[PDB]
Every structure is written in structure tokens, then in C-alpha cells.
Amino acid sequence: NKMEAKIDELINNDPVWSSQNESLISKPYNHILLKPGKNFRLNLIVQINRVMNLPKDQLAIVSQIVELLHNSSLLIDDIEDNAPLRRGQTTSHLIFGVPSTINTANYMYFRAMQLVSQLTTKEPLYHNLITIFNEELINLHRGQGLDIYWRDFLPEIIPTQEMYLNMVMNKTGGLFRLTLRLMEALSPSHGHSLVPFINLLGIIYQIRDDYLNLKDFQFAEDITEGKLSFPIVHALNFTKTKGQTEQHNEILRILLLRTSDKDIKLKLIQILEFDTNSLAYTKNFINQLVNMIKNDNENKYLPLYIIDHLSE
């Protein structure tokens, strides 16, 4: 009687979800929102909108979509990379646990997917925005997948610089392209697509990220992670090309230690500085990429300041 009646009412209604339940699942996400950098991504979307011209509130939704995807991808990335810190603050999984952090990050990817339907009610356009969203999230995961595979199967595969760049086009290029492609699709206005420029921005951003992780130290957490970062990939291929067997193996040994020992981390930085000159090689490489934009007098890529502060 009463039990069957309560069951019948339950199965005939939509699943129950409260604002309190929403606050509970949002805790790991709210924690990363404390991290700085929002001002900066906001600025890049604003500046690109000088070309695209989306109306303010449509731009607001693109921005929210991008923020959810970026933050969620970093919450998961930190679990994948066993990262203890992100922008100087403790990572969410060390506070709320890996289980809630993964579930919340995933939930926010689906909340971002839902916000796409609010960019437009035109069916054909909507289909195109969801396809952009789906394609670039697929690319991001393919790229992350390779980054993780090389790291976790090392020394099975040592990537070449070309392989690394293709991984970055997928991994870091994904959200850069997603944000821009959504904006170019919604533009009510503009010229050649800016996807090439934004691919270049993504490459520069990732090589700089990998470089600064080591250069600031010289926490160099990337060494503890065992990551096949741009300078590491240069150093492994360089020692291999030169027949520098012992040095090649010592770089591999230190990466495989997954060490937090400052003195050992410093020894790998010494190899990269004195033996392969990989940090200077990387500095020069980022400069060359940046100059491709600085000297784009014919605006083949462009439609300064952002590019220089790209790391934040």
C-alpha cells in the first residue's frame, strides 16, 4: 500500500536533485575556481571578439563553456599527473579525494555541453556548434592520452619533436580551437579563419609551460611526473643522435625515479644545461615561434601583449 504508492510516485517523476545536492557535487570545482587566470582567458576571448563581434551575452555563454571545460580538464589532469599544486594552491583531489574530483570534473564537462544549446536555437547552427565541441574534446583526449602513454610506458617509446608537436596540436590545441571555432561559427560579421594563429598560440603556450617548469626551478614538478616535456624530448633525441649512451640513460633513469629530491632534479637540469643545451634550445624555439607572429607584416596569421603573458 504505502510502499508501492511511494515507489509509484518516485518512478513517475523526474529524478530528484536539490540545490543542496548541487552544492555538494560542486565542491571540487569551486575549489579550482579560486585559482587565478580567469582574467586572462577572459581577455583573450574579448580581444578575439574585436574581430568576431558576438553580442555580449552570447559571448558570455562561450566564456562560461570555455571556463568549465578548462577547469575540469585541469582537475582531471592533476589526478593524471599526481600534481600536488596548481597555481600555488593544493590540488582538489588531495582535498576532496580522487573519486569526487573525477566525478565532478566529468559532470562539469556535461554541464558545459548543455550550455552549448543556449548559444542558439537555430537547428543547423546548433548541430555545427555541438560538432565543434565534440571534435575538439575528442582531440584534447587523444592528445592527453598520448602524453600519458609516453610517460607511463617510458622507455618503450621516446617521442621525436615531430611526435611531440602532433601531441600538442591535439592536447593543448583542442580548447584553443574549440573556443575560436565556436566564435567564428557564431560571428554575425571577417576574413581568413584564425585557426592557424590559434594553433600557433597553443604550441607556444605548451612549450612555454614545459620550459618555465624547469627554468623557474633552475619545483620542476614535471621531472617528478616523468613527463616527456619539450626540453626532455630534445635532450633524449639529442643524446641518442650523438651516441651519448650514458647521458641518454641517465636522463631516463631520473625520469623513471618519479623523484621529489631537489638534488636529483637539479642533476637532470645540469644534463640539460651543460650536455644537451636543451633549455637554451627551447628558449630559442619559442622565440622563433613568437617571431613568426611578430614579423607577420602581411597578416597571414594575425587578423603582442597576450602572447608575451601567454603562460598565465
Ligand X SMILES: CC(C)=CCC/C(C)=C/CC/C(C)=C/CC/C(C)=C/COP(=O)(O)OP(=O)(O)O
Q: Which residues are annotated as a binding site?
A: 38, 41, 70, 77, 81, 86-87, 171-172, 206, 213, 227
Binding positions for Mg(2+) are 77, 81
- What's the angle, vertex CA 309, arms to CA 42 and CA 298, rounded to 5? 90
Site for ligand X in 6-65 (CB under 6 A): 41, 44-45, 48
Nearest to 261 by CA among 220, 203, 309, 216: 220
What distance in Å separates the CA atoms of residue 159 and residue 232, rounded to the nearest whole number?
10
Q: Least distance (Å) from a copy of itself to the CB of residue 290? A: 11
Q: Which residue has the cell 536539490?
A: 18
Site for a copy of itself in 38-97 (CB under 8 A): 76, 79-81, 96-97
Q: Least distance (Å) from Mg ion to the CB of residue 258? A: 14
Binding partner of 100, given Mg ion, ligand X, a copy of itself, none, CB within 5-8 angstroms per partner class? a copy of itself
DSSP string, 237-306: HHHHHTT-HHHHHHHHHHHHHT---HHHHHHHHHIIIIIS-HHHHHHHHHHHHHHHHHT-TT-SS---HH
| Neighbouring C-beta atoms of residue 167, cutoff 10 Å | 23
What distance in Å separates the CA atoms of residue 186 and residue 52, rounded to the nearest whole number?
8
Is residue 198 at the binding interface for ligand X, with CB under 6 A as the rule? yes
Q: What Rg, from alpha-carbon coordinates, does the chain have?
A: 22
Site for ligand X in 59-98 (CB under 6 A): 66, 70, 73-74, 77, 81
Calculate the CA dihedral of residues 124, 127, 133, 137 and round it to 10 degrees: -150
Q: Least distance (Å) from a copy of itself to the CB of residue 95? A: 11
- Are 213 and 232 contacting, i.e. CB atoms less than 8 angstroms apart? no
Calculate the CA dihedral of residues 145, 231, 38, 55 and round it to 10 degrees: -70
Is residue 173 at the binding interface for a copy of itself, with CB under 8 A as the rule? yes
Q: Cβ closer to a copy of itself: 126 or 217?
A: 126
Is residue 98 at the binding interface for a copy of itself, with CB under 8 A as the rule? yes
Amino acid identity at 199: N
**Contacts to ligand X by CB under 6 A:** 41, 44-45, 48, 66, 70, 73-74, 77, 81, 140, 144, 171-172, 175-176, 179-180, 198, 205, 209
**Contacts to a copy of itself by CB under 8 A:** 3-4, 7-8, 10-12, 15-17, 21-22, 24-25, 76, 79-81, 96-100, 102-104, 106-107, 109-111, 113-114, 117, 123-124, 126-127, 130-131, 134-135, 137-139, 141-146, 148-149, 152, 165-166, 169-170, 173, 195-197, 199-200, 203, 285, 288-289, 292
**Contacts to Mg ion by CB under 5 A:** 77, 81
